[PDB]
Amino acid sequence: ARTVKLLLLGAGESGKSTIVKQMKIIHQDGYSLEECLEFIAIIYGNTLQSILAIVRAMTTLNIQYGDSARQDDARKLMHMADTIEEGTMPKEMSDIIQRLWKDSGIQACFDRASEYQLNDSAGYYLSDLERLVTPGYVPTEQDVLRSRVKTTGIIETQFSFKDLNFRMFDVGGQRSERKKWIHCFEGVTCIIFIAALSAYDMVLVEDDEVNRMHESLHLFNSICNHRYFATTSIVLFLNKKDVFSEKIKKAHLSICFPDYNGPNTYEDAGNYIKVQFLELNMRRDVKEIYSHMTCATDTQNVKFVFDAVTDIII
Template sequence: VAQHRANVRLWWTRSSLKEHTAGLSNANIPLFFPKLECIDNANQSHLHRLEAVVAAKCVRPGASLRSIGAADVRGLCGGWLYFRQRGGSPAGATFCKEGTCRMGCTSSAEERAALARSKQIEKNLKEDGIQAAKDIKLLLLGAGESGKSTIVKQMKIIHESGFTPEDHKQYRPVVYSNTIQSLVAILRSMPNLGISYGNNEREIDGKMVFDVIQRMEDTEPFSEELLAAMKRLWTDSGVQECFGRSNEYQLNDSAKYFLDDLDRLGAKDYQPTEQDILRTRVKTTGIVEVHFSFKNLNFKLFDVGGQRSERKKWIHCFEDVTAIIFCVAMSEYDQVLHEDETTNRMQESLKLFDSICNNKWFTDTSIILFLNKKDLFEDKIRKSPLTICFPEYAGAQEYGEAAAYIQAQFEAKNKSTTKEIYCHMTCATDTHNIQFVFDAVTDVIIANNLRNCGLY
């Protein structure tokens, strides 16, 4: 739009309007408009009106606006601009009450009709801009297990009708599987860490759990025998020691949440609660799209988790998004990737954020940074030093200072002097926290979207 507006200010260098409008079509309008310029500051309002039409036709071809033809251009130019004729001066030109130029131009029915059409174009442009400002497209990005899918679930809870009874029923086997798989991950890591059971009798219980996995029955309700074995294992001192070193292997964040509540999960009439659903972990594959309304706006939220390896092939498809919500798991500063057990997870997130924040497709896109899992981070920072990820860190091992340092590391990746990073500390499993944060950032999104549409 800026380029076309600059072009409008070039002098009209040819001898007559007719010469340039003859045979004019939609295809060559972009070649026509660069010949125009506002000559007198008194006509800035006319220039702005013409700029709006230029922007609508040449920059926003998808807008639902009337086509601009030769007659429209004659009307626009005759009514809104002075023309510099060869060897003539624009200083002596004046406008008629009807809005036509007296420099050799005469008012005609065709020109008046063109002016009427141009006014309709302005109206349509404004209406189209207002509607565009109401359509908010959000792209949810971040490394694996950073909480993106949980944010999507929260939008369903906060802005839709929540989860249906059928949804609760469908998440039941997911809860069973997450619980058993978490316990198995701990048991499998014990030999690697040189940890033994506190009670050797737990070997039998462990075998029972492994047999369930082998038979692929981890999505089934717990039998009484299995439930008892799982409870004994979870309270074993060796298992607890291994759980305390979970940053040294791969373990779901929800492991403790579910294993601490085995009696409830093992009840015959068990149905997952809303919090249970939020805590479940299912790897996202493909692109998940969620629609919801908030503050009289229409939101479309895209979760593209699981597509990172092919990002270069699809990232340009989202160049028109209103904003990007980038999720970072703060608690993963001392953990390594699933697929590469030598790469620190937070360092990987920093690289990913750098590539997104400075991507050519998102030059004018607002970036909202969610430093997520703040509850887990606050608990972990007292026991595990931040220097594991940032050796140069010399601050205190406490939440406030450490969190501020992490935020500064991400903000430093922003190479733009005009783009602002909107950062929030979040706990994706806390509905009230996410509701508060999303309400706060929506106002920023609205303002930026209106500004981009030229309405703010």
């Protein structure tokens, strides 16, 4: 059969690894019991880092607890975080986290997550902590999809679909991904560029002067117009449409694009962002780039979108 080398490109946290997990669920055979048990430590670490970030932001943003009794809980939490074996979640810690999560001050801070770059799965895990710490708990595929682990190795995802043999690789532009650049850009059949729609109101951890969507736009410009990819199929995934639909109700898109004069609705603000990316294609009138609004954690959405990508490839 024909071999298809497909690259998933995009800024950190855009959704590359999530699409890779979806390929395993959709085109391979999901996760076995033992593979799900693997994710418990990762999920606990993810959960602890999420609450610690919200707690530190209480100080940074100067928000006070709805209940002063929480201040001691926060202190004990920080202390335990330095004491527990990494990846564990003892009863005392989970009890403290649940009390903090319920606090109105903590919730006011959670609502201001954009201001401190909180990972998107924070609310997912934290609002369902009791299920995660029940003796007998086995991560569901959605739990696994929502997780984030630091993978230093090169992971090739191979699967057959529509009589094509896919060899898929997820690659970032950050320096730690350099070993992948030695060969990842050779003989690429298709590039799926992923950009988080919800990145529009966020700045970088280091450069508070640099907007994340602008960084993604900058990378797309570099890739899209590179001579290596003049005839490569390129598809744009405007990811995190679910987070975006909520964000759009509170932060105006003009925060990112001063020229934006629209009503800030999911559809119009979404199309405006799509245009900002697609207009960068200087090969546009010659080489067309399709785009899809995606929710990488939604298996049905990813299944449909990847099917369209495959028909494009064919």
